[PDB]
Amino acid sequence: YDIQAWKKQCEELLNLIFQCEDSEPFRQPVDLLEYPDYRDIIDTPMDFATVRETLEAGNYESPMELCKDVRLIFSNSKAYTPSKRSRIYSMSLRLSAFFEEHISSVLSDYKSALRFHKR
Ligand SMILES: C[C@H](O)c1cnn(C2CCCC2)c1
Structure with missing residues (x-):
């Protein structure tokens, strides 16, 4: 029922994702010099370094917000x-x-811990 445990769990999962070769295209923002029309198709660019930085800055309130950005x-x-x-x-x-x-x-x-907190 630890309401804060998700943060370190997300840091560890991001570390595993960065070691995975499949994360290579997604580790940093898409390069507009390589894909010039990227912003004509994609409204909100997102990448794993931005997710990690948002987490480390204390700018995610829940793991659901981090999930939404990874998705x-x-x-x-x-x-x-x-x-x-x-x-x-x-x-x-x-x-x-x-x-x-x-x-x-x-x-x-996290959802279970929050339900316990608000019981
Ligand atoms: C053509 C290819 O399937 C694709 C999709 N998105 N992108 C971006 C994200 C990763 C680096 C460039 C390329």
């Missing part, structure tokens, strides 16, 4: 992909599966 990394990749003949979207799908598998208990424990 935006994957939705942006899906929206920008021209087709399955894209290694980057395929990497996003595997990385998304890995993230969802690990974030499930973080969200459940």
